[model samples]
Target: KVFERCELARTLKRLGMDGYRGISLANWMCLAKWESGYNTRATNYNAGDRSTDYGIFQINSRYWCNDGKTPGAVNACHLSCSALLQDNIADAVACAKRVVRDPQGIRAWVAWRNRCQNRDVRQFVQGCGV
Candidate 1:
């Protein structure tokens, strides 16, 4: 399901994501915008790597999620890729925490690198009023 911006902010804050993993809520907002446009069903198939990214956070089948077909998938989240396609994002958030805890941190998300890195993203959360 696609979430409205304020609903998303409220949900994230309730999940303790406002300032988790050293990333500000604003940056997380920007990342979500660029990664999934707040749509939980978002998916990106990378033909080059034959891997897929799933959900708002774009957790990857290459390691974080299992697609049942990707070879050598780490499946570190211990869940199917479809878990990210649900309306409830609890599993998605849990797996994302794992990603953030990784050595590369939230930088593992290329969207953050390309769009949210080292920038003041307070504007991203403006109307959310979180």
Candidate 2:
């Protein structure tokens, strides 16, 4: 599912992503825009660490989800990486919440750091009515 911008914003808000862990909805929108372009099935394999990023939030196999192949990886979200690739995004959202519970907060995603952080992110949700 490749969500339209406002559709994703509204969906995230409904899923309790607005101001989740002190991260605004717009920031979340920005993160998704850069991370996976709001595509539910997006996946990116990291050759350097032999891990993979999955789903809209791109949760990683190295520390978030269990893919059974990432060496010494920890399944902190207690979910299979496959769960993150579903269209429903419920599990993906849940795992993303667990991710921010860590010390990194939203900085868990490098895309947020490079693209959304300290930038005019409000544009992402400006017309979403979220």
Candidate 3:
């Protein structure tokens, strides 16, 4: 997860890498820190062979990786769940950045972070930034 995300971060930096700056980095990092704690080995319990697939990116197997599911529904599923052991933060952030690309939605993450920071988790939604 770390390596993958790091690679994604480097890729973003090399590319346009606009907005996704300042508080954006910090906010994304906080998610990484809280969600995965910088440890690719972290996870909840009771996930069978799939282990519920929550790792670095916290991607659940059903919604990710599985070809039977959505084709692009999940990225970073390569390496046979190796991404969980790797810490793919950048790809997650980049995926998110793409959604928030609209100059109007650039602060979309900020809005989500703000709501969560205030303990209002349900205030946000998927594709909000898009």
Candidate 4:
């Protein structure tokens, strides 16, 4: 599912992403925008590490979800990477929440640091009424 901007904002709010771990909905929005463009089935493969990033948040196979292919993967999220590609984002959202529980918080996503960190991220949710 490719979500519209406001649609995604409201959905994330319902999923409790608005301020999860001090990361605002707008920041989450910013992360999703750059990570996977709000597409639930989006995916990226890392040639260097032979790991794949899956779904809207681009959850990686190397450490978070298990693809059964990434070498030395820890499967911290305890889910199959295929689960992340589902249209229903509940599992992906849950895994994303687990990711931020680390010391890095939202910084778990380098895209967030490069694009959303310390920036005026309000535009992501400004008209979304989230």
Candidate 5:
């Protein structure tokens, strides 16, 4: 399952991000594990997740909400845990890459665990964690 998961993880990273040029497959997996424990449908406590972290990429629920009203489309409320279902993973992953490309953005994700106020900043590098 690790390999299969990695395949999906890589897609999430490469297609999701802009350049899709720098991040390695392993790096994407590490990030997936760190953020949502490899659970494609992982949800935080309320899942009314009113943040940028909805679904797979943990996109802020707020953004999903904006995209929510579409018929049969994802909503912020549900996307909080089911965003991946919409193939939005690639989109979110791409956003992360852009942030990492910036120094201030790099520290921003690392600080997320410390400050909830800070958005989803990039903290997981390849092999940085288990």
Candidate 6:
């Protein structure tokens, strides 16, 4: 489902994204917005590495999931990459926690690193009453 920005923000806030696993709700909203445009089934394939990014959080298949095509997939979340492509965000959130705890912190998302990180994204939830 395609979620309005505020809708997404409110959901993230209720899900503890505001300060969970070192992630701010605003940044998580920014990251998910840019990554999947709030579409749960979004998927992006990188031809350069033949790796795929899946779901709203766009978890990478290289180290976080198994695309079944990558020779040495890590499957860190021990879930099928396609599992993240659905509307239920429980698995996505769990995996995202692992991503945030990694050395890159939230910088694992290039979109967040370039567009959302260290910025004042307070407006993301301005009227959401979060």
Highest lDDT scorer: 4
TM-score for each prediction? 0.95, 0.97, 0.40, 0.98, 0.43, 0.92
What is candidate 4's lDDT per residue for 23-120, written digit by digit as tens?
A: 89999999999999999999999999899999999999988999998999989999999999999899999999999999999998999999999899
Q: Which TM-score value belongs to model 1?
A: 0.95
Each prediction's Cα RMSD? 1.0, 0.7, 9.6, 0.7, 7.9, 1.3
C-alpha-based local distance difference test score of model 3 = 0.42
Q: Quote the lDDT for 109 in model 6.
A: 82
Candidate 3 residue lDDT tens string, 1-130: 3434454334444444434543333344344445555555665543344335345434444433433333334443333333444443444444444444445443443434553354533222222331
Q: What does candidate 2's lDDT look like per residue over 30-54, in tens digits?
A: 9889999999999999999999999
Q: Residue 77 in model 5: shift from native, Å? A: 18
- Model 1: per-residue lDDT, tens digit, 32-83? 8899999999999999888999999888998999998777778998999999
What does candidate 5's lDDT look like per residue over 11-123, in tens digits?
Answer: 55446542344544445544556566555555443334334354443434443433442334344233232434354454445455544565454333442344432334343
lDDT scores in order: 0.87, 0.93, 0.42, 0.94, 0.44, 0.84
Candidates 1 and 6, the one with greater TM-score: 1
lDDT of 1 at 115: 90
Model 6 has how many clashing residue pairs? 0
Q: What clash count does candidate 5 reach?
A: 15
Q: Go through the candidates in order and give the clash count of each.
A: 0, 0, 9, 0, 15, 0
- Show the colliding residue pairs in model 2: none
Would you give me the overall lDDT of model 6? 0.84
Error of 3 at 87 (Å): 6.1
